[PDB]
Amino acid sequence: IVGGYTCAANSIPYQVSLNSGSHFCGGSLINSQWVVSAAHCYKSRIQVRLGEHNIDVLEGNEQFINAAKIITHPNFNGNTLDNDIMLIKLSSPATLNSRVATVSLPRSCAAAGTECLISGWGNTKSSGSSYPSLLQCLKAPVLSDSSCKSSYPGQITGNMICVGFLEGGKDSCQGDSGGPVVCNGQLQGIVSWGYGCAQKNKPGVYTKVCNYVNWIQQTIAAN
């Protein structure tokens, strides 16, 4: 996250870290047994780390559970990043408490201008690399279709929304991928792609979760 702030410890209880020797992507807990992330974060073996704040130190509230099943969307397109969504089933249920909780799925898509909260442990520098140990937060609005499509001509599908600032300086970056965008208590976006990070006129592009509730539900019921 570029141009964010350090989140209060355990103030984003649905945030998870996907680990394969080290942190590589974020995710969101939507059920005690299921985590939603981005398909381009796919890896064969994944350990899901809940209850994290400082990923470099054991604090005592963590629950590390390995992924039992990893299901990428059947229509994910690696070229366009359409349908950039993946579901991970935990080998054992997470225990829900003050530090580990689920985030609601959207009841409807969000209005333009809706204030959201984005979080992750991705790169924090606009020039160079710097991965934080402490979870970062960023408040950003959902941009209209117009501003989103004018920013990326012919590259925005109906399964994508832009969230951020056209002036740059504030955005999600590498390492935040798969992470949550929560607006009014509902998971509206998944960190997906963009042209770089925090560049002017190039806001982050996110998977539009409100189109996938049926797929999520059907998949969880089937597995």
Partner: peptide, 7 residues
């Protein structure tokens, strides 16, 4: 660090 595999 802490918790293991299998799987």
């Amino acid at each position: 660090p802490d918790a293991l595999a299998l799987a």
